[PDB]
Amino acid sequence: KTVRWCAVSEHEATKCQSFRDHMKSVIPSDGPSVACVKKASYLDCIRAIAANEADAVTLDAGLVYDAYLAPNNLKPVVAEFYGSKEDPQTFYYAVAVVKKDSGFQMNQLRGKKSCHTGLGRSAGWNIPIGLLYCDLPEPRKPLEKAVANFFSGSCAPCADGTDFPQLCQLCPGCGCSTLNQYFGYSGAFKCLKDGAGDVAFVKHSTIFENLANKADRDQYELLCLDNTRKPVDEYKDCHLAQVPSHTVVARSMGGKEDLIWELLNQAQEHFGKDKSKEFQLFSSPHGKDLLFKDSAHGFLKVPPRMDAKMYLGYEYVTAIRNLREGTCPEAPTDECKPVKWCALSHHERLKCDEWSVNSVGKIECVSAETTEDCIAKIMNGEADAMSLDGGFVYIAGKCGLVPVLAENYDKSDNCEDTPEAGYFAVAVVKKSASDLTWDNLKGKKSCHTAVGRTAGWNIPMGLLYNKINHCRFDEFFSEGCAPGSKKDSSLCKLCMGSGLNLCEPNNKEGYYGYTGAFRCLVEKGDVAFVKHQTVPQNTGGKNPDPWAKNLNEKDYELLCLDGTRKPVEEYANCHLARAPNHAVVTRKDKEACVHKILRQQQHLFGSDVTDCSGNFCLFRSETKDLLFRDDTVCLAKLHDRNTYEKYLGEEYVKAVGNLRKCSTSSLLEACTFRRP
């Protein structure tokens, strides 16, 4: 079909007509076409697409947020990168360069000297002041005046010093051009180097452009949003905001996003960077930056799950909203706003609601459709916390959330203190054939508690993905039983069960669970994937069943990842990976509050005296493990500022990640697109 692009000037409108003409040529008779709808401005192109009069346009961050707001409600469908297919550089980072050991944190700039790249610029002002908005003295309008009282002097190019002198103190006159060496990225940075100002709100690339030698940067460092500093080389881990450089948008519903991609893509390949000589898609013969930015290297599809909020990022959004809405809480103090939990089900909403009233307002509830939606919500700001299993802890991590409290299941006189890292997913094989290794495990017979399990599938299959390469996880083992397959695979054809319960993920199956898989080994099975607590539990006659009558633990041996072999005695050093417990996650900030609020709450309705029924019990569920596993003794503190990686272990993260190449999830790729 034909895509109606939208230009905002006659020049840009001409270039669109060449794009239409040049396509009807190098594009098959039935390929992506491109019509041209010119308008007066960006906001008009936006509204036109909203009205289905236009199909798409390319906008900067600012206007991207503008296209999201109703009634427009548009979303990002295609981005432009400025590097290689390895180093896309689709975004840029608004940072705040400072001096080593300066002595201050973002949350305490009050009474400082700042260097902005120029008033009204994004990285240099909108974003920095947007963030510091409520930290300014009332009235907050005019804006220039308020920022003056905050920053005890500074350099704000293009700002009217005549009415508010404080902003041109470091650079009198506030020269809005190069005539002023403290104007711009380079200039604002020079305003810090020269020692004039304390902080230089600039871009991530700024310091690397005004300083070649590395030993030079060391004296400089970034200011992070969680009141911390870090090396200017680590901006991706410490930036005031992440903003998309240039984005193609379309109606969120019926915006023809796929068709827009089929055009842009099939176009960057015909007339893309240096591609053709007949037409330079990213070049403007008449003027600069038309339809696409001149410096664009190509296009990149945006994951469909992505929407403007998630795309711009929490920092960005919060900053621009302050700027445009201007709304701050009356009584600050930071008494920790109620924690918004996320229910992903009716019964979960109910249990959460009961929890709410019994929290005296400390806890609030939010309802999202899916575990992934909640996660998006905890990123957005719409939700604050929630518990997730290892698989989703990983996904929340890649999305920027963090683990704060891990659900503990064992009991002691100090459950909250000592954290639990979970059991171990080991690989057991009959020591009858001493020649089997993690490597020659291919083409043999396996045993899986059930496809989709942590210990009997995810971990092993994920750690073994390298050999498999392709997503044909069954075509790796000659046979074996893994309940849950297509009921006829190489792994399902070795499972008993009736004509219906044949190879099924339930008790009605024989080789199901941690016991069934061990059985599968005692029979038609070379390798069996289970947990450390399965061997000395299904042997010694501890199982009065026919097969496990009294098998011997000593006759089985554990396989280690490095390649060697070891007994079930010291599995600790011969396990595939460690399966974690569920853990509550939250946005980086809010961490202290969640950590705090969830403690008191745990003392009031936790695993206290068996006084439920007549009182609310936070770890008991109407139906089954609702907001929390019903076997959660307490919410242990992760002590160290555990991050999804430090909390899952390297083995675990590797497993899940590989496995995610076959079992995609909309949320995960969207977050990855923003941070690979």
Side-chain angles (χ1 to χ4, degrees), residues 25 130 144 214 229 247 311 315 319 343 422 610 629 643:
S25 58
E144 306 190 56
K214 195 273 181 178
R229 289 137 170 280
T247 299
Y311 202 60
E315 304 94 338
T610 310
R629 286 232 222 123
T643 32

Side-chain angles (χ1 to χ4, degrees), residues 137-442:
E138 315 170 67
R140 273 126 188 163
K141 192 164 298 170
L143 184 54
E144 306 190 56
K145 195 216 294 290
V147 176
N149 304 182
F150 179 76
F151 286 108
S152 66
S154 46
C155 172
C158 318
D160 165 53
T162 304
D163 293 68
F164 331 96
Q166 280 299 305
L167 289 302
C168 314
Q169 197 186 73
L170 281 59
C171 64
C174 271
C176 192
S177 61
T178 47
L179 181 65
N180 167 27
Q181 42 142 35
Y182 287 174
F183 153 94
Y185 277 126
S186 306
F189 185 34
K190 199 184 175 307
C191 160
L192 180 71
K193 174 160 179 171
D194 293 346
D198 311 7
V199 53
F201 306 114
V202 298
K203 203 189 292 151
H204 65 291
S205 57
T206 300
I207 197 163
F208 290 92
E209 287 161 344
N210 274 194
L211 239 37
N213 295 64
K214 195 273 181 178
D216 309 353
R217 309 145 178 172
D218 286 6
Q219 217 55 60
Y220 301 104
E221 68 176 6
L222 270 17
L223 245 170
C224 327
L225 275 141
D226 82 306
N227 317 313
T228 302
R229 289 137 170 280
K230 290 163 192 169
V232 303
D233 278 79
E234 287 153 43
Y235 50 80
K236 296 195 188 164
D237 273 302
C238 170
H239 54 262
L240 289 73
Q242 168 163 190
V243 3
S245 191
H246 200 52
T247 299
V248 177
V249 298
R251 289 177 287 288
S252 289
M253 207 90 255
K256 304 159 88 180
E257 61 264 358
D258 285 358
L259 170 59
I260 289 178
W261 173 243
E262 197 171 312
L263 156 152
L264 288 172
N265 192 49
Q266 224 167 310
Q268 71 170 319
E269 211 55 47
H270 287 327
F271 321 88
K273 179 78 170 300
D274 306 0
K275 209 94 302 185
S276 161
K277 301 187 71 294
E278 213 89 15
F279 175 54
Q280 305 74 280
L281 180 68
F282 306 128
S283 186
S284 299
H286 37 297
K288 266 61 209 62
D289 309 312
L290 280 65
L291 261 43
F292 304 105
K293 250 181 172 57
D294 287 347
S295 47
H297 273 44
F299 296 136
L300 264 179
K301 173 114 114 185
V302 178
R305 175 64 185 65
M306 184 82 78
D307 76 64
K309 301 256 280 302
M310 185 190 304
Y311 202 60
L312 295 173
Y314 85 91
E315 304 94 338
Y316 192 80
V317 182
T318 49
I320 185 175
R321 278 191 67 181
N322 286 351
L323 243 49
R324 310 185 182 206
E325 300 176 9
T327 52
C328 307
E330 193 60 83
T333 319
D334 321 296
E335 236 94 85
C336 281
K337 301 142 62 183
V339 175
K340 302 200 192 69
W341 199 266
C342 199
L344 43 170
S345 126
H346 193 52
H347 302 304
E348 234 168 17
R349 187 49 196 274
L350 292 183
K351 177 171 189 185
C352 180
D353 281 348
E354 200 180 322
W355 189 14
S356 194
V357 189
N358 284 82
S359 76
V360 192
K362 294 208 76 61
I363 286 295
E364 281 188 350
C365 307
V366 170
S367 299
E369 190 161 358
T370 63
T371 283
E372 292 209 323
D373 278 341
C374 275
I375 296 175
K377 261 181 178 61
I378 291 173
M379 298 161 55
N380 275 49
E382 304 183 6
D384 302 318
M386 81 177 300
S387 188
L388 300 168
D389 60 3
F392 279 114
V393 161
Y394 168 74
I395 299 185
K398 305 279 287 192
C399 292
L401 310 176
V402 291
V404 300
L405 299 136
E407 291 189 350
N408 273 177
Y409 308 144
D410 306 316
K411 60 81 177 186
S412 70
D413 307 276
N414 45 319
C415 172
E416 309 194 304
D417 302 331
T418 174
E420 308 179 0
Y423 64 86
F424 313 72
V426 74
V428 199
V429 291
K430 44 179 61 183
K431 193 181 68 178
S432 310
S434 63
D435 61 335
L436 316 166
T437 310
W438 196 222
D439 314 316
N440 63 71
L441 222 74
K442 188 284 153 56

Side-chain angles (χ1 to χ4, degrees), residues 495-643:
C495 304
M496 30 273 254
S498 306
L500 297 189
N501 308 297
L502 169 68
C503 186
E504 296 267 304
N506 59 167
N507 224 311
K508 238 119 296 189
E509 171 57 56
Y511 296 149
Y512 169 84
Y514 292 85
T515 46
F518 178 52
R519 167 175 183 156
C520 164
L521 178 70
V522 197
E523 296 165 42
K524 296 168 181 172
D526 296 348
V527 60
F529 291 113
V530 277
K531 59 183 173 184
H532 72 92
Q533 45 181 51
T534 52
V535 186
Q537 175 192 297
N538 256 52
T539 58
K542 252 67 66 58
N543 192 53
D545 276 291
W547 54 283
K549 75 294 181 173
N550 52 48
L551 278 292
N552 286 63
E553 167 204 301
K554 189 70 281 301
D555 284 351
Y556 293 89
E557 187 173 55
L558 299 189
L559 193 165
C560 324
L561 279 167
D562 55 296
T564 69
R565 299 184 65 185
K566 287 173 166 53
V568 192
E569 195 70 290
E570 37 137 41
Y571 50 65
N573 284 68
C574 192
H575 55 72
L576 301 176
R578 194 162 184 169
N581 314 344
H582 294 203
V584 179
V585 311
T586 41
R587 216 162 62 166
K588 179 43 182 178
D589 45 295
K590 300 214 209 66
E591 162 170 38
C593 284
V594 172
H595 191 302
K596 169 182 169 182
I597 288 185
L598 244 64
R599 177 134 277 68
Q600 314 168 181
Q601 296 290 169
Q602 158 154 285
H603 295 331
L604 299 142
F605 313 112
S607 203
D608 214 53
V609 191
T610 310
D611 297 1
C612 307
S613 312
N615 226 172
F616 169 76
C617 275
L618 191 272
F619 298 117
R620 233 85 168 188
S621 304
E622 204 71 14
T623 61
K624 196 177 187 55
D625 339 305
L626 296 175
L627 309 168
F628 294 105
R629 286 232 222 123
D630 288 349
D631 44 326
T632 300
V633 178
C634 88
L635 293 177
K637 53 225 193 174
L638 302 183
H639 278 172
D640 66 79
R641 61 276 193 181
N642 269 290
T643 32

Side-chain angles (χ1 to χ4, degrees), residues 451 457 474 482-492 502-505:
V451 302
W457 183 269
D474 66 336
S485 297
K486 302 275 297 308
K487 296 167 173 55
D488 58 12
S489 68
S490 169
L491 307 166
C492 242
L502 169 68
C503 186
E504 296 267 304

